[PDB]
Amino acid sequence: EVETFAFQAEIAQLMSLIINTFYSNKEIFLRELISNSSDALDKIRYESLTDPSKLDSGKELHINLIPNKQDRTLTIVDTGIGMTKADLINNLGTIAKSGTKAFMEALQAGADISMIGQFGVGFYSAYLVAEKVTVITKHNDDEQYAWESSAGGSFTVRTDTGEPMGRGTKVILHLKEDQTEYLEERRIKEIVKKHSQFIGYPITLFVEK
Numbered sequence: 251e252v253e254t255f256a257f258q259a260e261i262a263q264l265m266s267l268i269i270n271t272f273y274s275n276k277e278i279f280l281r282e283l284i285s286n287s288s289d290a291l292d293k294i295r296y297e298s299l300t301d302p303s304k305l306d307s308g309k310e311l312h313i314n315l316i317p318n319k320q321d322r323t324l325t326i327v328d329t330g331i332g333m334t335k336a337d338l339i340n341n342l343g344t345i346a347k348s349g350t351k352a353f354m355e356a357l358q359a360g361a362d363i364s365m366i367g368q369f370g371v372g373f374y375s376a377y378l379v380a381e382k383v384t385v386i387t388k389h390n391d392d393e394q395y396a397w398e399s400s401a402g403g404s405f406t407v408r409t410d411t412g413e414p415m416g417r418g419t420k421v422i423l424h425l426k427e428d429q430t431e432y433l434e435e436r437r438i439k440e441i442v443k444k445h446s447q448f449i450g451y452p453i454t455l456f457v458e459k
């Protein structure tokens with residue numbers, strides 16, 4: 251059973267700007283997603299200090315980057331705190347409204363798209379390179395869900411029946427046809443070294459078979 255939701259108008263506006271604006275420096279999407287993973291890992295690490303059983307769903311705190319050329323996907327996996335259904339439908343978009351307005355105003359004042367993370371809406375930079383984004387996520391207090399959007403104003407949420415994740419979030423970038431450079435080992439390595447070199451969790455770049 252699949253539920254379909256409309257983005258808030260401000261967030262749809264932001265996604266169209268990201269998809270339609272000419273902007274060559276697309277590689278910053280990966281810094282933003284890794285940063286979000288790092289923040290989620292920080293949150294479960296902090297919570298586990300007062301309730302160690304929150305790590306019963308998995309003690310390892312890490313980030314994996316998995317390219318797949320056959321499916322044309324780049325997947326960013328983390329074992330962070332994960333997202334509830336309420337986060338996916340309501341909470342994250344509510345938080346994002348204010349950051350979106352501020353970001354769109356800054357852009358009109360001369361900021362550029364690479365500053366998106368300073369406004370808390372860096373996830374949407376995924377649409378610089380992805381035609382579709384799938385997010386599989388599992389919080390300790392909720393079931394495993396799959397969120398998906400190809401933009402256009404709507405997203406879906408369903409319970410996920412795939413492989414159980416334990417805890418954390420998998421962001422699956424279905425890359426645009428002309429963005430397959432982000433499946434290349436040498437390119438991902440270059441980007442992580444330039445933008446993400448001091449992230450405090452192990453980042454493993456998987457190689458393709």
Ligand SMILES: Brc1ccsc1-c1cc[nH]n1
Pocket residue numbers: 286287290328330331332333337342418419
């Ligand atoms: Br946003 C967000 C909110 C709770 S978890 C999470 C996340 C985890 C990986 N990326 N984003």
